[PDB]
Ligand binder design. Structure first.
Ligand SMILES: *[C@@H]1O[C@H](CO)[C@@H](O)[C@H](O)[C@H]1NC(C)=O
Length: 218
């Protein structure tokens, strides 16, 4: 269904579609989300317009999966996902990104973590991820610009596609592994707290169509 309410949510079959206009107060405009299907994955689209607050995120419209039992990264065998999306509109300053928190305590709050992992399939405008570039890295047979920095106590690793990746098939475990193997990341001791995919919107007019998004933790 459709709603333009700041905190609108639609749930079903382990999947949840959320408007999540958490920063709306930082700007002027609106955000509407439509959950088209929640069967065999999530199918949804977000329509929005924002002005003002140039460098502040207005929303993170997204789809995510439930994680009833938290497990360590190393204990998980695979975190497969697929995303099929397109973006249209004008003056778009926004991304298309996976977001995941991990923490050493499985019972940690799920709205923050010790680490934040982001995978930016899309990047529109001059927006930039947290921290600074670490250079190019190969993950899952695709090249990414890896960023690292702190956002408070939390360390954020953002893998940014070098071209907008509108049809994606991947395994988030490959990203945790890269961090494990090259950046001293404690996959042994970190629990996956969240698993979300959406669009951080700053300013402009945009329509994100997510034809399909799937995700699981096995
Ligand atoms: C995504 O596409 C937009 C609009 O064509 C472009 O300006 C931006 O450079 C692209 N980003 C990436 C990561 O290729």
């Amino acid at each position: 269904q459709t709603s333009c309410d700041q905190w609108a949510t639609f749930t079903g079959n382990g999947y949840t579609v959320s408007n999540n206009l958490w920063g709306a107060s930082a700007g002027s405009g609106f955000g509407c989300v439509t959950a088209v299907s929640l069967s065999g994955g999530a199918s949804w689209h977000a329509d929005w317009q924002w002005s003002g607050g140039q460098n502040n995120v207005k929303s993170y419209q997204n789809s995510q999966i439930a994680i009833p039992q938290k497990r360590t990264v190393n204990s998980i065998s695979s975190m497969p996902t697929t995303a099929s999306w397109s973006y249209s509109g004008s003056n778009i300053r926004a991304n298309v990104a996976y977001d995941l928190f991990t923490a050493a305590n499985p019972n940690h709050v799920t709205y923050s973590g010790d680490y934040e992992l982001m995978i930016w399939l899309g990047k529109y405008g001059d927006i930039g991820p947290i921290g600074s570039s670490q250079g190019t890295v190969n993950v899952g047979g695709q090249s990414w610009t890896l960023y690292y920095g702190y956002n408070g106590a939390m360390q954020v690793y953002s893998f940014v596609a070098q071209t907008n990746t509108t049809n994606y098939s991947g395994d988030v475990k490959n990203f945790f592994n890269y961090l494990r193997d090259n950046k001293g990341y404690n996959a042994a001791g970190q629990y996956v707290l969240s698993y979300q995919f959406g669009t951080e919107c700053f300013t402009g007019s945009g329509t994100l169509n997510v034809a399909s998004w799937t995700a699981s933790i096995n």
